[PDB]
Subunit: 144 residues, 12 copies
Amino acid sequence: LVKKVLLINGPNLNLLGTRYGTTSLSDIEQAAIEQAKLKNNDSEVLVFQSNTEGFIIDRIHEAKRQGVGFVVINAGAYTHTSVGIRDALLGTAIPFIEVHITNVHQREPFRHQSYLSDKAVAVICGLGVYGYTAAIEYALNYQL
Amino acid sequence: LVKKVLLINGPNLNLLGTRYGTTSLSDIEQAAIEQAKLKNNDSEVLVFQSNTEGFIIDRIHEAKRQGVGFVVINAGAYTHTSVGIRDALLGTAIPFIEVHITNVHQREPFRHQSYLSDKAVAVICGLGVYGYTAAIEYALNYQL
Amino acid sequence: LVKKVLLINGPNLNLLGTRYGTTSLSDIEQAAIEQAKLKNNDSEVLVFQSNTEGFIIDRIHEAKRQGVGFVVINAGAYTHTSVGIRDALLGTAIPFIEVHITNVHQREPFRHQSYLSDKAVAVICGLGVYGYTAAIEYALNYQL
Amino acid sequence: LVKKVLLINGPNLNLLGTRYGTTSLSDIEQAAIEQAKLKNNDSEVLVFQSNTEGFIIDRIHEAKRQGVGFVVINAGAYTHTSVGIRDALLGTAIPFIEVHITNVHQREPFRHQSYLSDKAVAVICGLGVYGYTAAIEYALNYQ
Amino acid sequence: LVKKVLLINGPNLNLLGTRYGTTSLSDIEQAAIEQAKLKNNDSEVLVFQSNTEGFIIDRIHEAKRQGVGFVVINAGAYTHTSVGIRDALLGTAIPFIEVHITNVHQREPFRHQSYLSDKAVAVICGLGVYGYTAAIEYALNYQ
Amino acid sequence: LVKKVLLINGPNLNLLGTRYGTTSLSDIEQAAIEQAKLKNNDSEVLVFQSNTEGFIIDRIHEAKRQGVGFVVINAGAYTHTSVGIRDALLGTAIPFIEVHITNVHQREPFRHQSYLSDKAVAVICGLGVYGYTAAIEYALNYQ
Amino acid sequence: QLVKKVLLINGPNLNLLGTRYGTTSLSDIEQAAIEQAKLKNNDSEVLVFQSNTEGFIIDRIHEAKRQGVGFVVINAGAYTHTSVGIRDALLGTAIPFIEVHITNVHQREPFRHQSYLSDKAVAVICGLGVYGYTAAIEYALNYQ
Amino acid sequence: LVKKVLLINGPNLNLLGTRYGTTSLSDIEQAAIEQAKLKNNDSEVLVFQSNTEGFIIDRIHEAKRQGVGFVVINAGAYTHTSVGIRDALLGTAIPFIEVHITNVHQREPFRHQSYLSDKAVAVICGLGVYGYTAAIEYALNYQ
Amino acid sequence: QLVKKVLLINGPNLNLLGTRYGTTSLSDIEQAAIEQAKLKNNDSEVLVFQSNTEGFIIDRIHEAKRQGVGFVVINAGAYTHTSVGIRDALLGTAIPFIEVHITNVHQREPFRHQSYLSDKAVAVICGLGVYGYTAAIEYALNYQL
Amino acid sequence: LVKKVLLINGPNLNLLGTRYGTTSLSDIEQAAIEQAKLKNNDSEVLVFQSNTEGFIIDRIHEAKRQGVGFVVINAGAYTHTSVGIRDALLGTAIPFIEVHITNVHQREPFRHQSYLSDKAVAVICGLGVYGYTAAIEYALNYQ
Amino acid sequence: QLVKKVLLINGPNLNLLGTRYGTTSLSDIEQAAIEQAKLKNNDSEVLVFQSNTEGFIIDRIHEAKRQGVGFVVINAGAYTHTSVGIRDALLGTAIPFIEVHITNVHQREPFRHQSYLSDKAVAVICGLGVYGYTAAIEYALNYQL
Amino acid sequence: LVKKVLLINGPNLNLLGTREPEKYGTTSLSDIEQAAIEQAKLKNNDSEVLVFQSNTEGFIIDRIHEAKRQGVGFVVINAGAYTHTSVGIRDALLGTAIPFIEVHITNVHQREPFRHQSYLSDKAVAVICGLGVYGYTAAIEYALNYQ
C-alpha cells in the first residue's frame, strides 16, 4: 500500500488561474500535500511543475531514486505531444493517473489523443481541481 | 447544489463480477444510495440498469419528469454506439458524468470513441468501482 | 396510389418541444392524420413513436402485414446508428422518406451519416415540421 | 414575411428532361413563378439558370441589390465543387434552401458532399420536381 | 463435449423468406432442433429470435444461467452495430459462431465490419441455411 | 459508325508549347481536322478550347444539338475539378475519351483523381500529342 | 444437374501444416476431401492442388476449366490478401468457389481482414478448423 | 528587378465590405496603384477582379503577354477549388503571392488546403488589407 | 536513333481472352504486334511474352535488357495492382514502357485504380480495347533511344 | 495601439544563414529593435531566441509579466510540434503573428500543420526576412 | 548453443546490382558473406539464394527448415512491400530473421515505407550499404538457439 | 574518411540497465559509450567518438550545433522518444549539414504504430533498428569509414 506519491503538473499550469476561478497551482499542490499529511501514516505527496519536457522527464527519473510509488500527473499540453514522458513513466515503472481539469473531449480533436491514457492506471477528466483529489485518494489506496 | 442524482448502468453491468473482484452491480448501487443518505441533507440517489438502449432513454426522460438534477452513467457498450442516449441526456438537459470501471484506453480502439464524452461534465475511467463514488461526490456538489 | 401511410418517429421525439416553439410530437401526429382524412378518398396515416430500436423494427414488420404502402420516418438518433431499422424497411419492401426537423448538416460531422438516405425515396431535412407535411403529400401521391 | 424569392438552377439543369418524364426546366420555373402569383399578395419568384459558376455568383450578387429575401437553389454539379457559390450566398446573407430532383445519397460518394448543406436553411432531395414547390412554400413563409 | 447449444437469430430474420427461397426462420429453428435430437446423446438446441438488441443481450445472460455451452448466432443487422451483444458473449464467456445466410462481403462495405468476428470461434457466411447446420455440427463437437 | 467528332481542350492548353517541344494548340487542332478530312467519307472533327468551365459545358450541350457522335476531350485542370463537365457528357449521353498529353500519374497526387475517367470509353495519358490522334482513330471507329 | 467435379486448392505454406497446432497434415485434408466425394456412390470427385507459387495456382485454375471442374474450394493462405491474379483467374474461368480459412483470420492482424476473394466467393468459411474444408465440399457437391 | 505587377481579386471580393469595416475592393485597388506610382521609378500595378474562374485564367494569360513580372492574388473561394488558376500562373511562369484578408486557418478546415500556397513565392494571410500592401512591396523588390 | 526492338508483355490470365468479350485472342494481339513492326520494313521487331507468374515476367524483363530490347509495351493485368517487383525490374534495367489495359480500369473496383506502373510509364493507355496495343506500339517504334 | 512587442525565434534559427544569404538572426533582431525606435514614441521591440520548447514557454509567461502587448513569433520546428507554445500564447492571451522565412507550403506535408495558425492573428510565410518587418509593422498598429 | 547455419536470401531484381550505383554485385555480397562464416573457424556456414519468383523464395525457406538453417538474413527487394507469403513462410518454419535494405527506403516512395517483414524480424538494417549484410551476418552468427 | 563522430542518446536512455529490460537489455548507457570511444581509439588514426545524452529536446539541439563548431563530421543518434516527435532535432541535423545514422536498440516495428513514424529516417544515411546494442557498434563502424 503506497506511501510516497508525486504530483506533476506540465506546461502552463503555473498560470492557473490568472485569466476560470481564482484557484492557483499553489492551491492544488498544497491541498494534495495536506491530503496525505491528514492520513497520518506517513503518506507524503511530493510536488513538481515545469514547462520543459526534459525537466519533467528528469523529475520522473529522480522519483524512482526517491522510492516514489505512484504519480498523479496533469501533463497539460505534453499529453498530446510527449512520447518522452510516456517512456519515462514506463521506464521507471511507476504507476500513474492522468489528470485534466477540464473535459478535453470538449475541445480541439488533437486534444482527444493522449500519449499517457493507454498506460495510465486511470484518466480523470473534467472533474475540476477535485480531479487531483480523487486521483490522490486512489493513489494512497493502491497496493505496492 | 444538486439534491437528486440518478445512477444508470448500461448493458452487461449486471454481470459484475460473476466471472474481476466479486463486487456486484448490487454493491455499487447500494454504496451510492448510502453515499447520499450519509450526506444527511435530502440528497438522494436513484438507481437504474438495463440491457436495452430504448429503456435507458426511457429512464432518462423519466428522470427529468421527476426533477433529477444530475446523472452518473456507465453506459457500458452503449457508450460506443448509442447516439440515442446522448440525445436523451442532451434533450432533457441533465448534466452527466460518464463512468468506466476499467481503463478503456487500454482496450481495443473502437472503445476509444464515446458518444457521451464530449458532452459530459467529466469522464472518469479506470478508477475502478471508486469512480462511481467520485462521480457522485461531484454531482452532489454541482450547482443547479 | 397509396392509401395506408405510416408516420414513425424515433427516440427522443416524444420530447418536442419542451426545451424550440411549443410544437409537440402529438401535434405532428394529428396534423399528419388530418392531412390524410382531409383528402376524402379513404387515405389514412397511422402514427408511431418509440425510443426502442427493436420496437420500431416490430412496427415496420406489422406495417407490412397491415398492408401499409409507404412510410414517413424521422428516426431521430437511430438515423446514424440503426442498420436494423434500415434492414426492416428493405426487408418488408416499403418505400420511405427520411425526415429531419432541423438541418443535420449544420451539426456534428457524425450526424452527416445516415443508414436510411441511400435507400430512402427522398430525404427532407431542415424544413422544420413542414418536413412531415411535404413527405406525406409526396407519400399520398406515390404509385403502389 | 418574404416576398421576393429567386429560383436558381445550375449547370446541365437546362436539359431536363431530354434523355426521366417530359418535365423541362422551363416547367419547373413557370410552376414556381405561378406559385407566388397564386399567393395573391405581391410575392414574386424570379428565375435563373446558367452553366457558368461566375455567372451564378454574379446573379446572387444582383439578387441582393434587388432585395431578394430568399433563394431556392439547385446548384447541380456545383453543389459538390463550388465554394464560390457558398461564399456568394454567405457574403450577401440571403437565406437559402438546396434542392436536388433525385436522391443524391443514392449516387456516387462524391455527391454526398455539398458545399451548400451546412449553410442551407434546409435540404430537400429525391422529392422529384415537387422538391422545388416545397422549398418555395417554405420560402414564402419565412421571417 | 458440449450438450446445450443456443441458436440466436437477430432482427428481421423472422422475415425470411417472405419476399429468397420458401425457407422460414421457423424451418431453420426446426432443422436445428432435430439435428441434436438425431445425435441421440441428450443434446439439445434451444432457439431464440428478437428484433430488440437489449432482449438478445438479456437472452445471452439467461443462456449462462441455463448451462448453455455454445451459441450459434446470426445477429443480422446487429453484427455491424452491436457492441452490446459482443460484450454479452464475452461477459458470459460462451464460445460462439457467427452465421450469415448470404455472403456479407458481396454487399455494402459497412457490412464487412463486424463486432462479432474477431471474438467468434468461426464465422460462416454465404453457405445459405446449411451455414447453420455446419455451425451446429461444430458446436456439438466442441470441448 | 461515328462521323462527327468534337475535340475539346480545357484551360491553359492554348499555351502549348510556350515553355516540352514547340507544338502549339492550333497544330493539334489542324491535325485533328485533317485526320478526319483525310478519311474521305464525310467525317468531321470540330475543335474548341476555353478556359471557362461554364463555356465548356455550353459547348458540350451545343454538340448534342449538332448531332456530334463522340467527344475527344483534354480538360486540363478541369479533369480534377469539374463535375459539371462530367455531368454534361453524361447528360447529353455523348461518348468520350479523356486525353492528357503528359503522363499525369507522374505528377502531384491530386492529379491522379479525375471526374472523367470512370465514365469515359478510354483514358490515354502521356502518349504525347499523338494521344489526340489515337483517340480520334478510336472515335472514328465507334458505333 | 448438381456438381460432379470439384477442385480443392491450398496456397503457400499450407504444406507445412501441422508441423509446429495438432498433427493434422495437408495430406490428411486432401485425402478426407477425395474420400468425401467417393463416398457418394455417384461419380463425384475431388481434385487436389497445393503450391507456394502464385502463377502456378493461377495456372491450375486455368487447367481446372479445361478439365470441366464445376467448383473450387480454395484456401489461398497468404495469397488471400495479396493475389488479385488469383481472384481474376476464378472470375476469368467463371468457376464458382468457396474461400476457406482453417483459423479465424478476424482474430489476427488487421491486414488479414481484407481478401481479394470474399466479395466474389460463394461463401467464406473461416475458423471452423479443418471441418471448414468438409463443409465447403458438402455445399459444393450440392450446387447448381 | 520587377517593374510591372498585376493585382488580381477572385470571386466575392467585389463585396468588401458592404455587410466588416468600410474598406472597399476599390480602396484596395487604388492604394496598390498609388503604391507603385510613388516609387517614381516606373513601376506599375494593374488590377483585375472577377467572379468567373475562366476570366481570371484569361487575365493571367494576357498579363504574360504584356510583360507583367509578378502577380499579387487573393483568389477567394478559388484558392481551394481552382487547379485551373494554379496551372495558369505556372503556365505563364509568373511568380506570385497568395493574399487572404482574414486568417483562413481560423475557419472551416476545407479552407486550409489551397491550390496556390505550395507554388506561391509567399502566402500572407490574416494581416488584413495590409496583406496586399506588403505583397506589393515584396513584388516591387524582386529579381 | 529510333527504337528498333520492342517487347510486348502480357500478364496473368490474359491467355484467356476471349474464351468467356469478342473472340479476340491473346494470340491475335501478339501476331498483330509482330506484323506491325515487320511492316515498318526496316528491321524493327516486336518480341512477345506472356506468363501468369510474377517471377517469370521479372525474369523476362531481365532477359530483355541482355537482348538489347529498347522499349516495353506491357499489360500486367492483375500484377498492375500488386506487383512492386515488375515495377522495379523495369526501373532496374531502365527500359522505358507503356502500360496498356484493354478495358477501362477506372470503371471497375477502386482497387484497380492504383497501379505500380502508371507513375513510371511513359504513358498509360486504357479502355481503347485491343487497339491500345497498336497505339503503344506506334509510339514505341517512334521513341528516341 | 501597442507599445511593447516581443520577437521570438525558435530552434535552429540562430543558424541563419551560416549555410541561405548572409542574413543573420542578429541582423533581423536589430532591424526589428530599430523599426520600433524609429517610430519615435517609445514603442519597443523585445527579442528572444531559444532551441528549448520549455524556455520559449517561460519567455511568453515572462512577457505577460512585462506587459508585452503582441508577439511576432517564428517557432521554427516547434510550429509543427508544440501544443505547449500555443497554450502559453492562449494562456497569457497575447495576440500573435506566426512568421516563416521560407514558404513552408513548398516543403514536406508535415510542415503544413501548424499548432499556431488557427489561433494567430495572421500567418506570413515566404516573404523571407521582410516577413518579420511586415509582422512588426502590423503589430505596432494593432489597437 | 549459437547459430551455425545461416541462410542469405535476396529477392527480385537484386541480381542486377550493380549494372547501371558502384560496381558491387550480388555475387560479391554472397561471396563476402560465405567467407565471413568461414573466418569464424567454427563450422559456421552461410548458404545463399536469390530468386525473382515469390513462390521459389517461399520454397527456399521451407527447404531451409528441413536443412536446419537456424537464422535467415533476407533482403526481399520489392517482396518486402508485397509478400505476406514470404512472411508466413518465416513464421511458418519459425526461423528467426533480419531484413536488409542496401539503400535507405525511408528516403524513397511512401509505399516503400511499409514492409511485411519488419514487425516480425529481429532487426531491420537499411541504408548501411552492402555493409548492411555484413552487420546482419555478424549478429546472426552470435544469436542464441 | 571521418575523424570526429558524435554519439547522441535521447531521453530515457540513461536508464539502460533498469529501463524495460525485457525490451532494451541490461547493458548500461555508460557501457555503450565506453565501447564507442574505444572503437575509434582502435582505428589508430586519430579518430575520436564523443558522447552525449540528454532528456531535453533543446539540449540535444544545442549539442548538435556545438558539434558543427567542433568539426564533427558524423552523428550516430538514438533520439529515443524524440525520434517520433522532434522535428527540431531533424532541423538541427539538417541546418549543420552533418550526416547521421538513426539507431533503435529494439525493433520499433514490433511496437505501437506511433513508434513506426520517425522524423529522422528519411534524412538519415541509414536506420539500424533492433540489433540491440550492436546497433551502435555497426553505426559507428559505418561512420568511421565514411567520406
